[PDB]
């Protein structure tokens, strides 16, 4: 008919004849095509899908059911392809499955559907619902998996991976992550993992970390990655600061003589997700007092207005032992070197001696005692190997290991589920704060609101960081009934008012 | 009758119908008098009630004050105000709802305004996000009140903003200055909207506390702030080696 109209009629009526033919050939038979649409999508016949897409572009209202069928099929395919996975490669396999589904339904949406943008939005919405598949009465398992995938990729692993391979796989990760709708939890998980990798030196290359921070920056703006960028920059300028400190101690009039190789890794405490969890006081050992005092002097005379907090929660130092014929050197946590300098006074010690020498609390002391006891670097002389009120134990002369640099530090990664739920609780607390703020700013703007209108407005405004489910908004509203400005109206139960 | 009220304030509960029946029996007796139908109620169960509940809450506040700190005090007091509102509608006439609560406030938060305002500075400095909310409510319905917290928080944001400007590094002072103010403004517009709420007395207490920060010059000097915002505004527009796109600039 296109040939016929172009060979007889005037050119100005090409559109009207073709549209009218489609207004009777396809639009009148819309019900039959829409009935077979779901079956055609489910079998995924590419030629029939293309022909159906053309014939429903012809009809004014035939397209949206095709869109809905494609979205439902893609959501079903993704949810079947990602739910059942092994528990040892779940972080890699989840992103791999979501990326595979996305690649298949970008190819099959760009080669037989002309890359129609409504269908791409349907794909985006379907995989958005796929990735955040919350188990009923359970928290979402997406952002933990994505953060663990990035920590697995970026850390210096013994599997061996090409740097450019890491680059393109992280680009694919960004394509997966662009729809996760829980970016706050992912942000803080990745902040903690980035902190651990940066501090412990487990990053494979700082350039890869910079690339990852940049990719998240184009993914979610600059305020999403401001803290991460500050972390990376304050880890990168650590070398310059340490060289400046060495130039300072060179320029001192008297001989400084620290005696210890010193690199300090100062971190911006206003942006690093580290915490001063060991609030119990710790005592710096004797020979390290000169180093701490000299670094404070450097940081106060060459630089101004900032107070250090020697957190000691994750410090390391290489103690050399020279009683068994100088056998080995052990890199330990600073509490472990504290108890080792306690051992330096005499072979046998006591519990109260350990508190009057190191001032630490009982939990960290128990942890270090267990760490040294499992290594058997220091044997325990009492009957029971647990925490003891006296804790009378001497040096272990039976230590006959083989590695010249064996450590009593195995907390390189850890990340216990207690820590994961603690970070989840902290993110939920910040979500409560932000959600209360959004609720009350909307209310103060309106001063009278229906309940559902307030829910919709809050979900719309707080969309910039996540999509809070109605449970959180109801919890925040019930909190704001007690605290501060909101009250149930007397006219109805869904007429919240500003007080 | 007042002993039944005091028994209710002690923790137990008398007959809800009988107590309200006889208090509402001081109205409904003078119902037919045209001028001042509540005149009998205003002189037999208003002055003997407000004086008694004023006396009862004059010493109950002193019991709680001397038995707990300021943090627990505002939990009990705001608990009592919520509780006394229920015990006012359960028994009394609806025309005396405001007077009992106002009498409860004026002897539980207005008699101890000297104590509360001495703890106003310590709560904001530690940035407690809970007691600072409870202090706002107890200092909301009382006129002598909140303008001390207005000046206290204005003396705290400016104190936090000052530490975001002084001792700031010259290496990247354009970006680091504007971010630090935005970090201070960003945190303290959410905290003033959640622990406190949107209150033009308090929102202006941020601006007055921040205009003394984005204009803070050391004595006898040119104000460094306008060029610090000018240099920063140039770096975003000027072609930088970082190569940030238009999306991260706009």
């Amino acid at each position: 008919e296109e040939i016929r109209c172009r060979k007889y009629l005037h050119p100005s009526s090409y559109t009207k004849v073709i549209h009218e033919c489609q207004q009777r050939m396809v639009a009148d038979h819309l019900q039959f095509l829409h009935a077979e649409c779901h079956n055609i999508i489910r079998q995924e016949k590419k030629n029939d899908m293309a022909n159906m897409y053309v014939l429903l572009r012809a009809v004014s209202t035939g397209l949206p059911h095709m869109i809905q069928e494609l979205q439902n099929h893609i959501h079903d395919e993704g949810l079947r392809a990602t739910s059942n996975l092994t528990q040892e490669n779940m972080p890699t396999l989840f992103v791999e499955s979501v990326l595979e589904v996305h690649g298949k339904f970008v190819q099959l949406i760009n080669t037989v559907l002309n890359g129609d943008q409504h269908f791409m939005s349907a794909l985006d919405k379907a995989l958005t619902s796929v990735v955040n598949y919350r188990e009923p009465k359970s928290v979402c398992k997406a952002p933990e998996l994505l953060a663990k995938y990035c920590d697995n990729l970026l850390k210096k692993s013994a599997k061996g991976m090409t740097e450019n391979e890491v680059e393109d796989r992280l680009t694919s990760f960004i394509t997966v992550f662009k729809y996760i709708d829980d970016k706050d939890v992912f942000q803080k998980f990745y902040a903690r993992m980035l902190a651990k990798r940066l501090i412990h030196g487990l990053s494979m290359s700082m350039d890869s970390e910079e690339a990852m921070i940049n990719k998240l920056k184009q993914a979610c703006g600059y305020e999403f990655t401001s803290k991460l960028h500050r972390m990376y920059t304050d880890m990168s300028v650590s070398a310059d600061l340490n060289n400046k400190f060495n130039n300072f101690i060179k320029n001192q009039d008297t001989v400084i003589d620290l005696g210890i190789s010193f690199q300090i890794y100062v971190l911006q405490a206003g942006a690093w997700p580290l915490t001063q969890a060991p609030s119990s006081t710790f005592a710096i050992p004797q020979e390290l007092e000169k180093s701490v005092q000299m670094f404070e002097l450097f940081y106060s005379q060459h630089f101004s207005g900032r107070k250090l907090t020697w957190l000691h929660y994750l410090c390391t130092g290489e103690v050399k032992m020279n009683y068994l014929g100088k056998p080995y050197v052990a890199m330990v946590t600073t509490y472990q070197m504290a108890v080792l300098l306690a051992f330096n006074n005499s072979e046998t010690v006591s519990y109260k001696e350990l508190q009057d020498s190191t001032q630490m609390n009982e939990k960290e002391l128990t942890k270090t005692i267990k760490s040294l006891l499992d290594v058997k670097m220091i044997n325990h002389d009492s009957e029971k190997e647990d925490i003891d009120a006296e804790s009378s134990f001497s040096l272990n002369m039976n230590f006959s290991s083989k590695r010249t640099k064996f450590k009593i530090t195995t907390s390189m990664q850890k990340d216990t589920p207690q820590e994961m739920e603690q970070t989840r609780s902290a993110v939920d607390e910040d979500r409560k704060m932000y959600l209360q703020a959004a609720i009350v700013r909307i209310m103060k703007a309106r001063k009278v609101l229906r309940h559902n209108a307030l829910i919709q407005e809050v979900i719309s405004q707080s969309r910039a960081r996540f999509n809070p489910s109605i449970s959180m908004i109801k919890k925040c509203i019930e909190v704001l009934i007690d605290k501060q400005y909101i009250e149930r109206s007397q006219a109805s139960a869904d007429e919240y008012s500003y007080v | 009758l007042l002993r039944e009220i005091k028994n209710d304030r002690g923790g137990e509960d008398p007959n809800q119908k009988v107590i309200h029946g006889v208090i509402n029996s001081f109205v409904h007796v003078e119902q037919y008098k045209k001028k001042f139908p509540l005149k009998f109620y205003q002189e037999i169960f208003e002055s003997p009630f407000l004086t008694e509940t004023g006396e009862y809450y004059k010493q109950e506040a002193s019991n709680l004050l001397q038995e707990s700190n300021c943090s627990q005090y505002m939990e009990k007091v705001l608990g009592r105000l919520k509780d006394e509102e229920i015990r006012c509608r359960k028994y009394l006439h609806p025309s005396s709802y405001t007077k009992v609560i106002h009498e409860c406030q004026q002897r539980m938060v207005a008699d101890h305004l000297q104590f509360l305002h001495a703890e106003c500075h310590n709560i904001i400095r530690q940035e407690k996000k809970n007691d600072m909310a409870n202090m706002y409510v107890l200092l909301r319905a009382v006129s002598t009140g909140l303008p001390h917290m207005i000046q206290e928080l204005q003396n705290h944001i400016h104190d936090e903003g000052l530490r975001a400007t002084s001792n700031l590094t010259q290496e990247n002072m354009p970006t680091l200055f504007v971010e630090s103010v935005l970090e201070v403004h960003g945190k303290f517009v959410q905290l003033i909207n959640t622990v406190l709420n949107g209150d033009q007395h308090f929102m202006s207490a941020l601006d007055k506390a921040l205009t003394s920060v984005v204009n803070y010059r050391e004595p006898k000097s040119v104000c460094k702030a306008p060029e610090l915002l000018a240099k920063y505004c140039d770096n975003l527009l000027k072609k930088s080696a970082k190569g940030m796109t238009e999306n991260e600039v706009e």
């Binding site: 501090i199 210890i260 190789s261 010193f262 690199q263 300090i264 890794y265 100062v266 971190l267 911006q268 405490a269 206003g270 690093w272 580290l274 050992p285 020979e287 390290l288 180093s291 670094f295 940081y299 207005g305 900032r306 107070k307 250090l308 907090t309 020697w310 957190l311 994750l314 410090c315 390391t316 130092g317 290489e318 103690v319 050399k320 032992m321 020279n322 009683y323 050197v329 890199m331 600073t334 070197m337 080792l340 300098l341 051992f343 330096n344 | 530490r163 975001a164 001792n167």
Partner: peptide, 18 residues
């Protein structure tokens, strides 16, 4: 006898109280 070397200490800085 115990002696230490290579202290890879970590510290946090924050704006001073004043």
């Amino acid at each position: 006898r115990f002696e230490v070397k290579k202290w890879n200490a970590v510290a946090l800085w924050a704006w001073d109280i004043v």
